[PDB]
Design a protein around this ligand. Structure first.
Ligand SMILES: [Zn+2]
Ligand SMILES: [Zn+2]
Lengths: 39, 750, 499, 39
């Protein structure tokens, strides 16, 4: 517990990160649907 | 391993001190050079094969196959313990006011507690206890009258072999019995490796003879220990073949049991004995050297012309025997492993500085970590190295690309020859774990990692071998599932809304804008930002306004189409990888992950209609993959829980489809029953599922009213055929018969 | 595994009969096609990974993770044993001159030895011993006066659950104590799985109910057994990492011990219970079908217009319950392994004809043997596959060149990345063993094999890694040493002179 | 032991084989020495 090297976020960036997570999820959904399209 | 605190302080000071870039380059070069040298030592070590093979089979602490014993490794920190004087007592004698005790050996005593005084000690071994000049005083303690417990605390621990207790102020000379009181003794001691001191010439000669005898014994034990290596390598060769043998601790492979017995049973004992003899030799050498130096100094001081050469404080420590027993052997496996651990810890601390991170990755650290330290060491150090490799690529597109290239190349090369050898597919766990760890940590290079994961997935999604499905497709599906379903929001403004309401863009109803074929080829026109620019932002009325929106949308879409990249149409193909994954019998987790994937793919009704259409097309697989469909059904019945979806599916003509499937596999059941007598413990699962599905379709009133006139014939034919069954009958067929009869009676009430 | 004698005779007949080349081609194609299909079945099998990894760690008899139990693997040939009557005795009654005994279950008795009479038996289970029309006579014996041991022999073994012994010609009715003599009984028997016969309708209803109960119990045990598979996968994945653990039978890796306990301890017990229940179900089904068939034939015989349908000898066996329990399950791992063993044995027999050898090597057998059967099966089968691969190249320069190319390519590819992965150099033992076996046999293509060995030696002689030295360089050095120092001559004129 | 398939040299050919073995041994010795020649 005495080691110094073992001991090495706001709300605005929190909503920003949540919105970015939603956008990435939607992009992955679209990208996975694009591989099932009939040839 | 003694240098944990040093590297801790070194890393902290290097991180907190602001310094020029040249010094940063020097420090990074030093750390990486030490790491590289230790890796080279490890991989070429003569015992590397034996230890590497044994690590995964037996549980061993040390490396007992070393030619040069290592002082650092055989001298751990032994703590003080409370020991009864009687347990180490061997010989005793008593007189009127003195008691003399001999121990079985030498002990480092620190405190003596007596529960109901002058204490003397010496470190000279004698055979007769009876045998004032050969005793050393240790502590004089007075007692309050009537006291019962006394604690003689020695400020400096004493190394003693014989003790003496004398009652200076206030016993049987034959038996030692005393009627005034009875005394018991406690010691705060521990074993120690030390020898009798040398005071004259004959003692020196005896010391020399003793050291020669010890060296002879050590040589014999060392040869015995080294004689075990050929047997160990023979057993290793026999284990590596892994040929099955026919006969619960005794059911393990006999060769593995023999390996454990050979290593942890005999090599360990020989190593411990050799360590003890080496310690004795070192103690004797130290004593002899100290005596020789003292005699030489006494001889030199007698002359007057020569002046005594003064030594500084550090020079005295260097010259004296003080700096003699703290150095590790050169060809030591354990010490090299410890240095590698320290290098990993220091590098992990250093990498939190972005400039140091860039210099480290420019040195070529990622490839060295990938080739050598991914699969070597304990589990903790392996996870540590994975963390460091993920940290080195935190926001560097080039480093991320390099790591992805290593992973992809290794997986592809292993997968090429997987057909002829499953070991290749079984030895990708660390590469895939690294990919998982890198993806799970969000950053600005997420797109490259996702591209790597998806490329590996699409490359190995169509291989039916269970090892590939368990070791490659499952990990990629878990990554995809983690990306599709992000963790629930924790912010106060979003504590209630779902992830569907958080997106800043609204996808088009009938079109798909993401294009995977061009994206996988790194086309900048099909990137993530380009895709996001193509979608309308989510907006934060009279009939005229609604009409205006309608025609504006329609003719703007027409204008865009006339101009034209062309978006894909939402027409899902009926044969893909999805059917293969959804029903794979290799592992159930892959099916569950795919089910969650496709459940999340159906949120907006435009995609839900196509998803339900595809899942309905997959209906005929219930018979072939009887119990393996348990997941898929649990998804399908979840997706049609609302009535209007059932009505839509009925309007597309699935009721004749389900009826025909039921009739066909009932005919198969009759044909099998007529011919054979074998038992199937999954018989009637497909029948039960399909009939339950038909019941669920029928229960709603509109379809029941409409579709009764076409389904009665199939229902009654199936009921009669099932009633004809007499031998190939199970519980599930009984339940199917009951439910079909219930449907038959419900239909005929009008 | 029942078809050892058949393939033995088939290989012998194909070898002894001289035949045209078209028939030889058809035979070779058939054998190779069966081998290929069995290999394809084995590699893609859902339990292939679990069994393949478990083989090298634990010692187990059978494959207990199978969805459809295989009758062939579930009913080995159990032998007759000598059992004392009192060991299986449960209930007994003595009367003035008769004795009635009930056993623990149904037993197949062959001969009875009596130490110091009429024998009756039946196979109806009753709960009370007190509970001439429900007995079947077995053998009537006359004894010479003063006889002490009589060995009654039953020409046909009897499947019985209750026995009765009568003294027709020369005991206590309460305790059964006899003052004249003391009798002790021995049986040449073995346990049997059979059910009570059916004679009327109520017995049919009882049989149907018992079958339903047995099926329910079997389903429960089957689900219990299939519930073990995810735990086995988790332990297998933990074992594959092989991370060192710090702490001599208990010094083995704890995960390997847990794997042994999970497979050989619990999966085995569940499989055994399931097999017993399946056998009981099968016996009950057979009894029910036999009774139904007899009833149907009796009903049809009463009508006069209809003629009795004559059957030939083979048709009777096909229709009746005689040919009902001799078929293996479709997706069975053990049976596929047995068929692959039979294919290897037959091909080894076939390859001793040079024309068949050429046809076989033209089919593409060497690559199939290299990719699939070199590392699969027991040790004996692996050595046999190496022998067959060596034999196929006995005097064929093209076949020897092809095999050498395969070996050299695999060794080179493994050695390219040996720095980053030791298993690459540790998974070449079978290729080097193949090379050793091929070189050790003297033929006319020794030069190509020696070239392969020397090329591999010079390619990997400068690598300092111990795994390469132990796994590549040592084998090549042994080959070279064997070639340099040939065995001492045995001819009479060269018995003394040196090489 | 009843399996048929399990049960599946003169002196002149023996001397010939011994001489051939000696010749092959000599060839292998020459080949091995040829790789130790200084370049
Ligand atoms: Zn060391
Ligand atoms: Zn089988």
């Amino acid at each position: 517990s005495q080691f110094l090297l073992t001991r090495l976020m706001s709300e605005t960036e929190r909503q920003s990160m949540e919105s970015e997570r939603a956008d990435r999820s939607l992009f992955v959904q679209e990208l996975l649907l694009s591989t099932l399209v009939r040839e | 391993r003694k240098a944990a605190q040093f590297v801790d302080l070194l890393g902290y000071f290097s991180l907190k001190t602001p310094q020029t870039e040249k010094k940063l380059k020097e420090y990074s070069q030093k750390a990486v050079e030490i790491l590289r040298t230790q890796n080279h030592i490890l991989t070429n070590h003569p015992n590397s094969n034996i230890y590497n093979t044994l690590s995964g089979l037996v549980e061993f602490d040390g490396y007992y196959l070393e030619s040069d014993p290592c002082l650092v490794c055989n001298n751990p920190e032994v703590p003080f313990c409370y020991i009864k004087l009687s347990s180490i007592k061997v010989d005793t004698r008593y007189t009127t006011t003195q008691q003399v005790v001999k121990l079985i050996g030498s002990h480092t005593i620190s405190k003596v507690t007596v529960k109901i005084i002058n204490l003397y000690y010496n470190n000279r071994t004698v055979q007769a206890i009876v045998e004032p000049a050969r005793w050393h005083k240790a502590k004089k303690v007075q007692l309050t009258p009537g006291q019962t417990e006394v604690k003689i605390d020695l400020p400096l621990p004493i190394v003693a072999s014989n003790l003496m207790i004398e009652f200076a102020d206030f016993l049987c000379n034959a038996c030692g019995f005393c009627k005034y009181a009875r005394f018991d003794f406690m010691l705060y001691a521990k074993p120690c490796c030390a020898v009798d001191p040398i005071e004259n010439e004959e003692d020196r000669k005896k010391a020399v003879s003793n050291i020669n005898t010890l060296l002879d014994k050590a040589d014999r034990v060392y040869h015995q220990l080294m004689g075990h290596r050929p047997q160990l390598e023979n057993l290793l060769c026999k284990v590596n073949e892994a040929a099955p043998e026919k006969p619960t601790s005794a059911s393990v492979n006999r060769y593995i049991l023999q390996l454990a017995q050979e290593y942890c049973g005999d090599c360990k004992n020989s190593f411990d004995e050799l360590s003890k003899i080496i310690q004795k030799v070192f103690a004797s050498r130290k004593e002899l050297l100290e005596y020789d130096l003292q005699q030489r100094e006494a001889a030199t001081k007698s002359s007057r012309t020569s002046v005594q050469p003064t030594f500084t404080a550090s020079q005295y420590r260097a010259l004296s025997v003080l700096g003699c027993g703290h150095t590790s052997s050169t060809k030591c496996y354990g010490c090299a492993s410890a240095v590698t651990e320290h290098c990993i810890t220091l590098l992990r601390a250093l990498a939190t500085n972005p400039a140091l991170r860039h210099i480290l990755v420019s040195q070529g650290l990622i490839r060295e970590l990938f080739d050598y330290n991914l699969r070597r060491g304990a589990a903790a150090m392996r996870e540590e190295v994975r963390q460091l490799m993920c940290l080195l690529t935190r926001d560097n597109p080039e480093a991320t690309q390099q790591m992805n290239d290593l992973i992809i190349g290794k997986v592809s090369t292993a997968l090429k020859g997987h057909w002829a050898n499953p070991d290749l597919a079984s030895s990708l766990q660390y590469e895939m774990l690294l990919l998982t760890d890198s993806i799970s940590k969000e950053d600005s290079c997420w797109e490259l990692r996702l591209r790597c994961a998806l490329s590996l997935f699409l490359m190995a999604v169509n291989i039916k071998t269970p090892v590939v499905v368990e070791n490659i497709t499952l990990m990629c599906l878990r990554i995809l599932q983690k990306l599709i379903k992000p963790p629930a929001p924790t912010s106060k403004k979003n504590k209630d809304v779902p992830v569907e309401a958080l997106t800043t863009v609204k996808p088009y109803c009938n079109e798909i804008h993401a294009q995977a074929q061009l994206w996988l080829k790194r086309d900048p026109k099909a990137s993530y930002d380009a895709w996001k620019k193509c979608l309308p932002i989510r907006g934060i009325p009279s009939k005229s306004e609604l009409r205006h929106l309608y025609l504006t949308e329609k003719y703007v879409w027409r204008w865009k189409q006339f101009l034209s990249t062309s978006p894909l149409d939402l027409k899902l193909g009926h044969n893909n990888w999805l059917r293969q994954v959804l029903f794979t019998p290799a592992t159930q987790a892959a099916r569950q992950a795919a089910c969650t994937i496709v459940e999340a793919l159906a949120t907006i009704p435009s995609r839900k209609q196509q998803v339900l259409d595809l899942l309905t097309s997959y209906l005929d697989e219930l018979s072939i993959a009887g119990e393996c469909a348990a997941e898929y059904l649990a998804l399908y019945q979840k997706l049609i829980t609302s009535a209007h979806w059932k009505v839509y599916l009925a309007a597309r003509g699935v009721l004749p489809y389900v009826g025909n499937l039921i009739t066909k596999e009932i005919a198969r059941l009759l044909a099998l029953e007529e011919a054979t007598l074998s038992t199937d413990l999954q018989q009637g699962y497909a029948l039960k599922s399909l009939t339950g599905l038909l019941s669920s379709f029928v229960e709603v009133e509109s379809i029941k009213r409409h579709f009764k006139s076409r389904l009665v014939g199939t229902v009654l034919n199936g009921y009669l055929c099932l009633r004809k069954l007499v031998v190939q009958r199970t519980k599930l067929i009984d339940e199917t018969q009951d439910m079909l009869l219930e449907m038959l009676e419900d239909m005929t009430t009008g």
